[PDB]
Amino acid sequence: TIINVKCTSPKQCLPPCKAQFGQSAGAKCMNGKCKCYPH
Known part of the structure; x- marks a missing residue:
């Protein structure tokens, strides 16, 4: 679930x-917001 939350990393x-x-949710952040990838 791509989240529009703010992030620094x-x-x-x-x-x-x-x-x-x-503890398996893989997420990342493009210098601006995080991203949740359910798996």
Whole structure:
């Protein structure tokens, strides 16, 4: 679920994206917002 949240690094995108899907949710951030990829 691509999220329009703000980010400074995709690293901080995993924790938040890891509390919605689980510890498998792979997410990233293009210097601007995170991205959640359910799997």
